[PDB]
Amino acid sequence: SLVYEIDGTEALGSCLRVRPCSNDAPDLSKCTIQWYRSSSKKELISGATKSVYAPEPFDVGRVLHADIIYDGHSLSLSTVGKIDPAAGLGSYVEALVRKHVDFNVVVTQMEDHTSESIHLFHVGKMRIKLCKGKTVIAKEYYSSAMQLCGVRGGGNAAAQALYWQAKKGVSFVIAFESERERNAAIMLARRFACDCNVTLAGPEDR
């Protein structure tokens, strides 16, 4: 008997979680979970396979859904309404878009990586670069090989982390000081990429 519901604040900046609603609902770790966003179709969010999903900028104004599957039974869930905007985000991105801009970050994957070393994540008009002091870690011009999106798993920092695949086989997970910086960096990168005729999105995004 599959009975679950999506809980959490339905706005950019928070996390949503599937929660059990009955005593005999199997544990979610034994289920297969897949998150989707409405387009009247639903589009799969690739890699969003955990019981927690943090919305990112593409999710704003969309209903989110989770399918949960166990042993041939399935249940399709939806948020109460569309994911709301983050207050002030548009205006902040508009101020950043005039500039040719960097963010303090921590790198949490390149394999796991626990460092308190602050790196700088430069989102430029034509390229992104990741630096630790004077050492450049990776530097790439916007292209079809690059992906950039909100991270698709759990953890307390998911709403403030993004995934960047610089080019095939080279990817990072990066965490910002706040949700607002994380989201502004995704929106800004995407806008600069679109000016360069590149559609910068996460793996399999539509």
């Binding site: 698709r152 307390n156 403030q160």
Partner: peptide, 12 residues
């Protein structure tokens, strides 16, 4: 990419 879905934790 397993990375895209790993838990992200902080304790900046």
């Amino acid at each position: 990419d397993p990375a895209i879905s790993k838990d992200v934790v902080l304790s900046f």
